[PDB]
Design a protein around this ligand. Structure first.
Ligand SMILES: CC1=NN(c2ccccc2)C(=O)C1
Ligand SMILES: CC1=NN(c2ccccc2)C(=O)C1
Ligand SMILES: CC1=NN(c2ccccc2)C(=O)C1
Ligand SMILES: CC1=NN(c2ccccc2)C(=O)C1
Lengths: 268, 269
């Protein structure tokens, strides 16, 4: 991998592995999401920020501050097959005092064609109190020289799917997968549940018939709270319709919301 | 990746990824086991066998025969860190009519030093009936030209750990993790639970205090039955012992039917 010529974005190539593919012999959306995380981490390392997924500055580390994912939006046109080489380009942009955005473009290495695109919204939070805060001028100027100045968006279309508000699923859910627990493989180096595990948990309540007859085209997921290493999660899904679904992940006990999302599936 | 000069083994390099590391900032044993699986799959593809993890011939496919893992033995000396390049070399050898063996050597790309080694025993089974069968001379002859003729073993030592018999854990277990279920990420392209998920499930019943003060040095795991996509598993562990050793059992939550048994050796950090 490497920063591009102008140093304002980062590119990396990946060869899809045998254990990374699903029933269609192509990469799963969770394999894709882990690759987005990997290219983001290598971009942060290349310019001197932390490499723990939080991309912090020395100023942020002294005032125990981290960047945390608020929303993840992924649209895939073609999932790469086993042995295929996929090239991913990523960049960040500041969004005023609200937070920051990281975008990605996935291309097939042989054809040069765009096979997918993703966007994520990040907010600043104190790692101990979990309290969010607006981005200061000093902890914004530090990132400015590593981002494009003019807007560069993976999803430019006005009124696009990545910015739509997601409602709360009402009980009873049409489908559910209850009692989901993380194991050590679901944790990151800081012992927190990896952001991609939540995507898997969301997808657990989609019936196998849909997975067998359709391909996932779009997934938008809002992150509200963490599942701790010892928490248990219930995954709920209701059809809102192409097939579209509304999703909710909540803690098994008290029903506390951890995530909400939407998925769009096209017939194979 | 590529077959080596003599065409009797296969090598591939891997750069350790950010999501592949544990609390020590080094690759987990499950990341290592998936890489062993990936290099084995690329070796099978390079010479014309199936690429679904079963490494079958056209003769085996018409008979609905597959190779399945009976035992997996992994010994790690140094886990590679995030961003490190690890080179893995793999080869197979026939073991008469009993089955076949696949071996691996893990090296650090920069130093050339051996950082780990692994060996696995495979048996032939009918995909549908689950009935094992001894290897025929015609099946054995199709693989002979892709394997070294003289013995080449990742674990040559006289009384080495890879061949020790594993006893059955007696109730009550000292530790347990109950109600383990696979999710879609745990499945392979054929919708079966990936062999590496069982390693994770075994490790789930090791207390967090051990994981925090020790590093896993050796793991030997025997595979007896599959966990189906809709089965629930209980993981049991009892200490058998600086070094700490444990006996492990994975069984189906309902009837207590054994799916795996194993041993792990941990050394103080
Ligand atoms: C604006 C922001 N830019 N970045 C960033 C991160 C890594 C590489 C380049 C830029 C943030 O984390 C926030
Ligand atoms: C905004 C927020 N995002 N998150 C979050 C939770 C889990 C994983 C990633 C991010 C919060 O806790 C609040
Ligand atoms: C003996 C055996 N050799 N092999 C094998 C597989 C792939 C490449 C080279 C060889 C078996 O599956 C059994
Ligand atoms: C010998 C056997 N190995 N196995 C097995 C089970 C799960 C994964 C891999 C292999 C059997 O069912 C019998």
């Amino acid at each position: 991998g490497s920063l591009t010529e102008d140093g304002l974005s980062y590119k990396e190539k990946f060869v899809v592995r045998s254990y990374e593919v699903g029933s269609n012999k192509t990469a799963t959306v969770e394999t894709i999401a882990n690759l987005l995380q990997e290219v983001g981490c290598n971009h942060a390392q290349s310019v001197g920020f932390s490499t723990d997924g939080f991309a912090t500055t020395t100023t942020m580390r002294k005032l125990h501050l981290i960047w945390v994912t608020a929303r993840m939006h992924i649209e895939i046109y073609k999932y790469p097959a086993w042995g295929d080489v996929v090239e991913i380009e990523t960049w960040c942009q500041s969004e005023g005092r609200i937070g920051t955005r990281r975008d990605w473009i996935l291309k097939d290495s042989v054809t040069g064609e765009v096979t997918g695109r993703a966007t994520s919204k990040w907010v600043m939070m104190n790692q101990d109190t979990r309290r969010l805060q607006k981005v200061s001028d000093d902890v914004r100027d530090e990132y400015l020289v590593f981002c494009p100045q003019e807007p560069r968006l993976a999803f430019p279309e006005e009124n696009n799917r990545s910015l739509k508000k997601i409602p709360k699923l009402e009980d009873p859910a049409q489908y559910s997968m209850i009692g989901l627990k993380p194991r050590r493989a679901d944790l990151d180096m800081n012992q927190h549940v990896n952001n991609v595990t939540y995507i898997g948990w969301v997808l657990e309540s989609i019936p196998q018939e849909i997975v067998d007859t359709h391909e996932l085209q779009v997934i938008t997921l809002d992150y509200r709270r963490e599942c701790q290493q010892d928490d248990v999660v219930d995954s709920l899904t209701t059809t809102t319709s192409d097939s579209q679904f509304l999703h909710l992940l909540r803690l098994s006990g008290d029903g506390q919301e951890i995530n909400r999302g939407t998925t769009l599936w096209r017939k194979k």
